[PDB]
Amino acid sequence: QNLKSTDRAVQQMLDKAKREGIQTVWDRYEAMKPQCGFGETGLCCRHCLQGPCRINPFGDEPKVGICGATAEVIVARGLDRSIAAGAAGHSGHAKHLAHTLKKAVQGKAASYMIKDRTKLHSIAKRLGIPTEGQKDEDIALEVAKAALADFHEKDTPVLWVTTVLPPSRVKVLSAHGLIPAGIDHEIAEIMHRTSMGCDADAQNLLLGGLRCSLADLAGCYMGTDLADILFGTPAPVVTESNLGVLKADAVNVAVHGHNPVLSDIIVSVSKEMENEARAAGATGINVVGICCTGNEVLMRHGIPACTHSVSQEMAMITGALDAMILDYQCIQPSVATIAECTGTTVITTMEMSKITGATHVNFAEEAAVENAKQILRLAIDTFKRRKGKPVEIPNIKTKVVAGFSTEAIINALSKLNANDPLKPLIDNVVNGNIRGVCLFAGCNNVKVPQDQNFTTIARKLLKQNVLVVATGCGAGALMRHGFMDPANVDELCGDGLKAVLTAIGEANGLGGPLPPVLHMGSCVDNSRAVALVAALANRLGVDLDRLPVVASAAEAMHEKAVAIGTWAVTIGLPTHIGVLPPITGSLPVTQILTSSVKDITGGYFIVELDPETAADKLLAAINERRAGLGLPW
Amino acid sequence: QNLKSTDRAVQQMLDKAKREGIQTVWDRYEAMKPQCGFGETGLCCRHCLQGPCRINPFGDEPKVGICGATAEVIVARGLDRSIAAGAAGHSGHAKHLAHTLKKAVQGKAASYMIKDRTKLHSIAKRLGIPTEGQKDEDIALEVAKAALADFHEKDTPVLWVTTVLPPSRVKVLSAHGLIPAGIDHEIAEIMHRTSMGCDADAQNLLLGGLRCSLADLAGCYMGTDLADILFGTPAPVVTESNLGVLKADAVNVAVHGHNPVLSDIIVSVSKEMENEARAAGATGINVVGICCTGNEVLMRHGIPACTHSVSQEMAMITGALDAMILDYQCIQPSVATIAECTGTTVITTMEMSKITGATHVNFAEEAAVENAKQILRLAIDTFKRRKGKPVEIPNIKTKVVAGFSTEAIINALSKLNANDPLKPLIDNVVNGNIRGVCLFAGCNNVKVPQDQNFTTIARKLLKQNVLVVATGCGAGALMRHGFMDPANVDELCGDGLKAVLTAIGEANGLGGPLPPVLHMGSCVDNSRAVALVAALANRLGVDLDRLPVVASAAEAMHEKAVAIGTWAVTIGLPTHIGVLPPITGSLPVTQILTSSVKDITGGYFIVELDPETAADKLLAAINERRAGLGLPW
Ligand code: SF4
Ligand code: SF4
Ligand code: FES
Ligand code: FES
Ligand SMILES: [Fe+2]
Ligand SMILES: [Fe+2]
């Protein structure tokens, strides 16, 4: 099972699944081998009914699409559509939050409110929305309207791009025509330009992709902004992770998907229903997180993380998961079928994300508490139905310190320098105690033994004094392997990095260091990493493509991860991807993405499947940046 | 060559291409065989980096996607993305026209103006925009703003759906949640819901598809509305079609793509440059049309159609095509390479639609005349470079009577009944002189011998007294085979239909019938057919799903054709498709699309590759509708 997942709790559940004849993602992957080499290389096109078209990577015919589409066009069109799809997910999420905020302040959704007034005001100020002598509700209404306005063309470009990146960066991007006009506008334009008989120049197509990736960035940043206003900006919190956070004597409820609009209410209502749960013979309702929405409630409330990404089915295999409450994105639809074997009640809540065989309970923001109670009562009923049934919860969990929003990080640093909080970080970059910064982001992928890339690369970087920050299922991987436990600083961290983590931790009253890796939150909260890096850029008076900062989507899966990787490149970062995106069938496209894009944005992809080699390449990228700033490395 | 195209001019050019070693779409198709059966059936998914996934249509593993996505989910997601892509094209086109109208009336694009004031006012009235005591420029500004507003969420749904279909139809669609909230909104929502781990219920996914198809309808209708305001509502016009419309002694300039914003100016400026062209040794500039933008200028100005869709390369093979002026959509990128052999100057004009190797001349509406002149001067230079070179223009063309906008049709009918113009049409439906109405729409497809389905089905329906209307490359097929020549009425038409065409024609001063098939314009002008059918529905006090009206995308290719077929189904029409869309890998999806959707919208797909059988099925559909209305059949 170690060949499938490096997580021992997951290995234990794989054995149980095998024993019980429950097919898993790894089994479905095995059944899929060998996968289609045209698809793998990107040399397939189904954009019209003359297809499917393919191009032999090497050899003889077919060499070109039926319409004349070259390998470089077909590869760039496929990639662009993946970016658009990612953008559509992150921005759909953000749009949902924008409508919820609007409803809240118009009196239509009393379960929601402005929880972070300071965040609201700072966002308003960043957007140019006056606050002076204005009601919070009116400021919030204006912020919500601005959010919604960024989805379409108007007299300004997308403000959730132009107001969050330094002017110098916006200038470089504007010069290449890369600033998005509107989020859904760009998504639609990608789908148009990649449809048959339209855009057929690789460079032109890829530039459209870069621009659509910035529309994804805007959706991410908007999502984080709005979730913070509504639900609170995260601060350091201590919790736990892995399957051992499930409790046989509790009603175990997983929140799974992405949007805190749902999970946040689940969390608060679950506390209100403790006595009902105990009436049913449970100790209480034990809310646990899966995927991003688990990250959202972990960051804000310390809700323990059950599992992530590829291993999500394993939570069910325990026999103790009474409910899995879904909104959208990254939910393996297998869960609806597995539920029949495991007894878990899988509940969908969003009109556009249903799964055949799951129970659908519409969740309206206007009736959030009522709908939450309905959902949680299904969970309590399920708990009762497993009275007397043995469960197998692996007794495996890690301690997780998380909640490192950019505000939280700035606050932590301010204990070392009150009026110049970034300076201690920069001081230690300059003196070599911090070599650079690496953001781990994105998914697990069944092709990579689960977590192997994240942990292998993180271990090498931490020993080389890289400050490691993490989001999404990257943060999930690292938390499950102990990288968010400060007790592991001595083992994992180089002396320089240890010194800094310890210094900041001791200044914050901990008597101990910050954790080895800083959990910056969900995938939309990759925007937090952008906020930090942009604040560092502004403080140094240089652009992001001069900073010793890199990203690694070390086990990427979702179209969202492709969009995130692409905007990381577009904002100026060397960006590692540890799975093959479908680009290798075109050398020219690969060359643009891994090399010539440096001349456009300063960032570039690093495609490297071997994690030890990936680490070396990321370190080289970091050190090149150090050299560029005249620093020793 | 008859196995490739039924068009003799195309056959002649195929022989020339073969002789000269110029690879064509048919050669690239042959080189692609056998095509991938997973793609053909829809049983392939590349929506994440765990893929590519496939499902054996029959047999053993793989039976399910890696994430657990079933055949029915994978098929419905693929289809939905095609609908979104189609919607993105038609609506991008419409958006372009909306911005042009806005610029025109704000004084920023003096080459454009309100040409059809009556159309402007009627659209304003339909949208609820007051005109009483308003300047045309201000009304137009409000119409342009309303157009742009339909792309995003607002306090009203998409008005270019809700104001163009009868209330009863809007009610049925609203009841199923099918009315689009915003055009780009829906496009984005499709891309989201079809991304990994989101929507995973075939019925739910397909309903999203139906709704996105109505967003495509809105883009089509908006495009037609705006093009009419800007460039004039078509009226009956006589012209010619096929390769024989090229002239060895003229500068031959093809307008190819979709948007009249470009081609309309090309047409007017070309007339202004006659003396320059003659200075270069040409008789003049001979503008000819390819694809929809050719249809636009044919409908409004009588510009002859050179060719369409699959055979577009053949115009170049003549040796006489001096320029091919492109905007976007349906342009085989092969043209850029073929140009090198044929001498043709291929010119792209839109930022989001470039082709490697083509000359790009940016076309700004603000500088339309200047940019048009630059483009046409490249054409004149090219004409000069072929002085003394033999050309082979097949001496093959047909007479085409076209320009049958819905207003034109209503006007024609009004000569028989001034104050109830639809009544003569309905009278003849009731008495059996007109059996029903069939709209031919959409593309040619290299898989079908070019035009074979259109002409085979049209011939059978016309003999059975079906009133045949046509748009896009369906209209192209039929025009090239003589179906738009009134001299062919005796040969093609049943006695009943002949009687009616003759009656209307003689009432309109022709001394002869209307043509066998009524050309209703470009693909966005499928919206004109909707206007006619909706006016008939309103006049009869019944919904569209009770009318003896069917559609046939007999040789469909583009994602746009899939979107159009899907909205034809959604508005209540039996809708034939003569190529296999990638749905056969899921029986449940096929069953929904061909059967159970009847219970939702009253329309349904008829998938039938055999054109004689397709004709029989369309006739059966028509006659079933007749029976439903209590009429003999
Ligand atoms: S768009 Fe071109 S390459 Fe793609 S399926 Fe159609 S003919 Fe083939
Ligand atoms: S979304 Fe599911 S079926 Fe599609 S490629 Fe990814 S794992 Fe395979
Ligand atoms: S030929 Fe396998 S992905 Fe299309
Ligand atoms: S396996 Fe051929 S279309 Fe994907
Ligand atoms: Fe996520
Ligand atoms: Fe078209």
UniProtKB/Swiss-Prot annotation, chains A, B:
Q: Name one Pfam family in it.
A: Prismane
Q: Where does [4Fe-4S] cluster 1 bind?
A: 36, 44
| Keyword Hydrolase part of the UniProt annotation | no
Comment on bound cofactor: Binds 3 [4Fe-4S] clusters per homodimer. Binds 2 [Ni-4Fe-5S] clusters per homodimer.
Instruction: Answer yes or no on keyword Disulfide bond.
Output: no
- GO BP field: generation of precursor metabolites and energy; response to hydrogen peroxide
Q: By its UniProt entry, which SUPFAM superfamilies does this protein fall under? A: Prismane protein-like (SSF56821)
List UniProt keywords, sorted A-Z.
4Fe-4S, Cell membrane, Cytoplasm, Iron, Iron-sulfur, Membrane, Metal-binding, Nickel, Oxidoreductase
One GO cellular component term, please give it: plasma membrane
In short, the EC number is: 1.2.7.4
Describe, as the record does, how this protein assembles with itself and its partners: Homodimer.
Matching entries from NCBIfam families are given as: CO_DH_cata (TIGR01702)
What protein am I looking at?
Carbon monoxide dehydrogenase 2
Which species expresses this protein natively?
A: Carboxydothermus hydrogenoformans (strain ATCC BAA-161 / DSM 6008 / Z-2901)
What gene name is listed for this protein? cooS2
